[PDB]
Amino acid sequence: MSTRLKIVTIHQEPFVYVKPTLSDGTCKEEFTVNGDPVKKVICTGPNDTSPGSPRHTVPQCCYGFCIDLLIKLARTMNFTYEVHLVADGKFGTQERVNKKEWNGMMGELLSGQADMIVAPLTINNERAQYIEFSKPFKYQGLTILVKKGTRITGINDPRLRNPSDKFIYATVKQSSVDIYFRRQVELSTMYRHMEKHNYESAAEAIQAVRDNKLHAFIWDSAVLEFEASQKCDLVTTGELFFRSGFGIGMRKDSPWKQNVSLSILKSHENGFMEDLDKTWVRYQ
Amino acid sequence: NHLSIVTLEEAPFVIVEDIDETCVRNTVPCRKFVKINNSTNEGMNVKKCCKGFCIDILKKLSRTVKFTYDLYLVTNGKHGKKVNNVWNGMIGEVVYQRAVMAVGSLTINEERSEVVDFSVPFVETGISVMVSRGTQVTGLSDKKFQRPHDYSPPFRFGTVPNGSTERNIRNNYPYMHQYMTKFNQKGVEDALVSLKTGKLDAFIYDAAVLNYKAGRDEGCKLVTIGSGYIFATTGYGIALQKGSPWKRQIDLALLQFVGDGEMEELETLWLTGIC
Ligand SMILES: CCNC(=O)c1c(C)sc2nc(Cn3nc(C(F)(F)F)cc3Cl)cc(=O)n12
Ligand SMILES: N[C@@H](CCC(=O)O)C(=O)O
Numbered sequence: 001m002s003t004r005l006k007i008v009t010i011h012q013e014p015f016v017y018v019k020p021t022l023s024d025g026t027c028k029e030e031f032t033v034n035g036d037p038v039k040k041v042i043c044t045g046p047n048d049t050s051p052g053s054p055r056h057t058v059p060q061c062c063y064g065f066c067i068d069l070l071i072k073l074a075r076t077m078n079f080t081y082e083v084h085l086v087a088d089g090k091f092g093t094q095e096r097v098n099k100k101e102w103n104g105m106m107g108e109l110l111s112g113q114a115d116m117i118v119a120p121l122t123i124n125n126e127r128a129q130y131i132e133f134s135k136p137f138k139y140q141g142l143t144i145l146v147k148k149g150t151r152i153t154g155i156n157d158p159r160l161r162n163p164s165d166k167f168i169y170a171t172v173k174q175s176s177v178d179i180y181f182r183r184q185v186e187l188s189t190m191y192r193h194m195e196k197h198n199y200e201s202a203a204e205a206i207q208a209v210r211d212n213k214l215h216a217f218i219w220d221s222a223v224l225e226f227e228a229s230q231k232c233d234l235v236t237t238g239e240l241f242f243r244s245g246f247g248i249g250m251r252k253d254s255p256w257k258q259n260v261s262l263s264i265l266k267s268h269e270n271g272f273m274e275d276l277d278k279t280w281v282r283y284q
Numbered sequence: 285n286h287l288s289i290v291t292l293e294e295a296p297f298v299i300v301e302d303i304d305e306t307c308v309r310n311t312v313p314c315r316k317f318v319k320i321n322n323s324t325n326e327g328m329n330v331k332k333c334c335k336g337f338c339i340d341i342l343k344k345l346s347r348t349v350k351f352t353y354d355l356y357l358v359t360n361g362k363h364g365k366k367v368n369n370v371w372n373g374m375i376g377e378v379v380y381q382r383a384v385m386a387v388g389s390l391t392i393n394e395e396r397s398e399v400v401d402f403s404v405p406f407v408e409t410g411i412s413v414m415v416s417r418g419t420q421v422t423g424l425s426d427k428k429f430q431r432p433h434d435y436s437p438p439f440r441f442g443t444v445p446n447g448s449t450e451r452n453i454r455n456n457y458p459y460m461h462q463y464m465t466k467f468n469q470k471g472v473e474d475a476l477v478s479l480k481t482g483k484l485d486a487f488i489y490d491a492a493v494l495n496y497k498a499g500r501d502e503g504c505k506l507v508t509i510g511s512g513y514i515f516a517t518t519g520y521g522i523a524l525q526k527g528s529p530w531k532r533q534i535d536l537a538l539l540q541f542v543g544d545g546e547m548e549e550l551e552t553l554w555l556t557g558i559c
């Protein structure tokens with residue numbers, strides 16, 4: 001028996017922080033700068049994050065912008081839920097197997113392993129052909145993360161449009177950025193360089209820029225601008241390109257789609273969304 | 285396949301011009317029902333020409349989604365207002381099924397979403413505050429707006445009523461709202477003149493229209509506070525009837541236009557400014 005909604009998410013700071021539970025199985029009581037308690041949820045997920053390796057599901061602690069949004073949605077709409085982290089650790093692309101298949105969170109939502117995707121999930125054409133997206137909860141774009149002192153104008157910098165084995169740039173595998181570089185004919189030369197250096201996760205890529213292993217990381221500005229504000233050794237460069245929104249993902253037949261979007265509009269209009277932005281995204 | 289479409293003039297999103305015998309250039313025909321007198325219902329549809337950012341989006345959708353349309357300008361209200369549970373404006377025309385869709389500077393909001401289906405947003409908007417350069421105001425949260433009588437003389441600020449801006453201020457800042465009504469403006473042009481003739485200190489309105497107007501202001505005197513900052517952020521969307529069969533293809537086409545760079549081109553053509 002269970003009418004509990006299965007929620008899928010991904011580790012992506014400051015939207016979703018993933019931490020180990022305490023030895024008793026609970027979440028450490030933490031507070032914001034405002035003195036308010038950090039709302040935290042139990043999220044099951046694999047410990048061996050390595051590809052093609054056995055996945056051992058363990059309870060973990062999940063909090064952040066996306067967790068507070070879920071909690072507000074669950075309260076507004078009156079639904080019960082259980083959160084888990086995407087087994088393969090990916091956002092989701094459609095790949096050729098003649099048959100085609102969705103991987104990542106997309107795959108889980110379409111297989112029925114999830115009933116809702118609550119994460120910084122990009123709203124694009126490819127995904128919208130198969131799932132219902134809510135009205136966006138955030139509007140942002142793509143930017144470039146580099147180690148401080150690296151001079152790059154942006155996406156139209158010669159070190160990017162004319163690729164070399166010297167200057168190595170990348171994004172995350174099976175992500176919306178990957179989709180974008182693969183579909184756009186103008187970025188074909190850029191995608192061929194990228195496909196060789198793309199990372200399993202944004203955390204692996206951000207670490208690789210820190211370790212001088214990767215020179216430029218092309219990713220979500222909501223994530224990059226936060227990361228550069230915390231790790232002052234890393235800097236974002238240039239202006240935003242391919243502006244896009246983040247939204248809640250559901251299957252086309254979902255009976256919650258109308259109320260998920262209404263709740264997101266109410267939250268934009270009453271300042272709740274701006275309050276989440278201030279608590280999690282806006283750091284000096 | 286031949287759709288009744290409603291629009292409303294608001295530069296640069298929808299610009300209305302007089303006819304040449306027909307409509308030339310990037311203009312599309314748009315009719316306006318004009319009354320014979322104000323003591324009768326009798327009137328005539330005047331043939332006009334329509335252009336703008338939103339008209340270019342409609343031209344691209346008609347080609348991509350494959351539909352033809354009869355475009356008309358709304359005469360019963362403006363964007364949309366619920367009066368004793370009865371909607372007027374572009375929202376009302378869709379609700380009472382006189383139009384299959386509404387195209388223009390139409391703000392997505394929760395109460396309009398209860399009665400109409402909205403496309404994905406295609407223009408970023410919200411509420412902005414316009415002032416003459418040098419007016420010390422943080423945003424809508426400023427005590428000059430929140431508690432206006434704490435100041436001598438009090439801050440003079442208003443909006444154009446009956447739209448999504450006034451509705452949001454009414455729902456969030458009840459004191460500010462009841463105070464603002466004496467500064468209600470007939471339209472954007474009257475508001476900008478009141479700011480320049482020192483008769484108004486601040487004009488609160490749709491972020492996308494204010495940013496366009498600031499970017500074109502002769503001498504660059506009128507500015508949007510912050511970096512053209514947006515409170516209660518939302519977007520313009522196409523309104524369609526609830527359960528509309530057109531929504532799917534319209535969203536997919538809009539997402540394709542952003543992806544291809546067609547949307548950035550339209551922003552360059554219609555929205556960029558000098559200031
Ligand atoms: C076709 C896909 N749309 C876009 O890529 C897009 C624009 C091109 S302009 C714009 N503006 C918002 C602003 N916005 N709009 C809303 C809402 F809820 F009203 F939909 C919330 C927020 Cl953030 C969101 C958004 O995705 N876009
Ligand atoms: N775009 C607004 C009109 C202007 C405003 O009230 O800010 C609306 O759809 O209501």
Ligand SMILES: [Ca+2]
Nearest residue numbers: 005115254255
């Ligand atoms: Ca369900």
